[PDB]
Amino acid sequence: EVVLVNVTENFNWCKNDMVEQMHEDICSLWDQSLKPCVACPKVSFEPIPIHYCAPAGFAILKCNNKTFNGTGPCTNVSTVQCTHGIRPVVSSQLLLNGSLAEEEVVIRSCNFTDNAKTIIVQLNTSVEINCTGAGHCNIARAKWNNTLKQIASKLREQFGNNKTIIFKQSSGGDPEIVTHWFNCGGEFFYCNSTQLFNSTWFNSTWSGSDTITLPCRIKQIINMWCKVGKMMYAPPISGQIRCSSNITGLLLTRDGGNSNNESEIFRPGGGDMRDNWRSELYKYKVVKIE
């Protein structure tokens, strides 16, 4: 668990995708909660933070270089047996309660030129998102506005300084993809994120109200199928559950059909469900005991 330098090691979060070795059944990501419910559900479930522990004969190398795109060489390395817990366990579009970037807003991808790969954004200034039982999440418009301005600025830096950066709503065949879908404990929020992703930046005139209110549907997990990976839901007729997180980053995919050579279009969400996991796993690499 200790850390020392003077030994360089090569990393590549792409070739060594380590969520690719975290494929255990859904019924083991949840344990039955014994929380004295003393209105109540018969059985309740709690999520266990997502993490990876190195099996015997193997160790996990952790790159401690703060600003690190995930690939290339790494000087400051350390040895651990487990990666750091990821919470929340699902998060489709926004990334909450993650680690903030040092001084700079950082974006990364396995291949920026390949629109198939997810773009993972890491902010340096957290944006609060307060959600309630009444079925809505709130985000300060001024703070989100500045966030997009900083993100669009980095995206330009990656795709060319004279590119107009356009944010559009998700496109997909399920609410888990289309909405910002995340869990705060055993309560799952499906939030309409159209309002967060409906702007264009730096076209010809770019150099609403007080708060952005996202409508959200809330479901409570009450069971699941183990060999199928299917969750089972019920309305939270339990009452009003509150949840406040920090937006610390986000997932984007870039459009491949865009006929405008002067713009790039980005939509919220990744190309894979476990992309939220990947946003937190770029500094690790599994190796054999030396």
Place this chain on the structure above:
Amino acid sequence: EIVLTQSPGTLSLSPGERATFSCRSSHSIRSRRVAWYQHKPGQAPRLVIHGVSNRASGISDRFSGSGSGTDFTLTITRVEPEDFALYYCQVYGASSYTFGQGTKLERKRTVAAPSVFIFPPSDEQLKSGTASVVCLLNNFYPREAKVQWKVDNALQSGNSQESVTEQDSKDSTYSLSSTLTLSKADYEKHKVYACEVTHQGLRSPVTKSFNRGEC
């Protein structure tokens, strides 16, 4: 499990006429998850209607879907030549996926009797020890026709097959072949080979025949 039954089996209309397709469900479809598809031969099926009444993208406003519970309808205000095709209803979602048997929208025209021709087995085929006799019904309407083989006045069974063309795009007629297949041995021991056809355009069954090894 949900069984969908469409009617009519075949809808025969001229361009400009209204079309009404019925889909009946054994179960009340509370979800309103009913779709209609158009399918033309050799082409990908195409979504026409979803959610009972939602016109799919690119679909002409001549199409509309309605109904509820057990009975669903696809209607075309005024049929156009490109509408001629098969139409299927389906239920979808929640583990319930099931299709109707389809309705054919074909083009109406005046009744046309088939021209019947019979073909003796070629003596080149006879050498290989087999004898196929071919009967041809050429350019008729409607598609409904009955073809029976009789050898020395005996009704043949389980030794013939038939095939029908798609509706001709120019005269809107059909053509049909029926092939009677016998062994050289069974062929020799008979002389009169007749093809007997019945059609709506004929006021009586029509026979085409030949005497074996003679002309």
Place this chain on the structure above:
Amino acid sequence: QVQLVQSGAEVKKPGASVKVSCQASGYRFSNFVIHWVRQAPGQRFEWMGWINPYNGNKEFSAKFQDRVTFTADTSANTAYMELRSLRSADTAVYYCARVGPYSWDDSPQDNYYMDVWGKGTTVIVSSASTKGPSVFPLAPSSKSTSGGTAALGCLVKDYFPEPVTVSWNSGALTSGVHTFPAVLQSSGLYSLSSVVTVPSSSLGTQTYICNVNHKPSNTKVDKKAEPKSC
């Protein structure tokens, strides 16, 4: 434009397995569920199951759950359907289709209709091996005459698998031609006929030749059709 491109036709022995691929373009492949549906000769469309490229989740028809595997490769924008323990009744056109777009106002799966279909891929299950056809004349006469016009043709018998093509006089004759869909004989082999109606007055001045091509067996045959020397 949204498009699904499917792999080519397949011929298989009973007991074998077949893998059909379905490649997407014009949209984000991983973001939409893909259905698999078949239609056998004379049968209704049958839903086999779906796969979700985004999370790997799948659903199966109870009829096929034991014999079918759905898979996806997001890096290749391709979904795959494999069906094992094949039987003659599995002979069908197999179609992939994308679900429609989901919207906030929808209930989950309101969009699980078949929004965009592939053109399908023919899978033939049969114990028959490749077999080139015999081509026999269908001779004109007074028995295939309709006053001014006569009928003649070619019987293309006992071939496997589909397809054969038939032309006449090397393409010089197209009007009046009817080439019938193949019939699957009980022997497991195919047969079709091609016929053409012509003026009876040209049966002595005009040569008629049907050109039969059967690629699967590399068979090419030109058969002259002639009024049976009578």
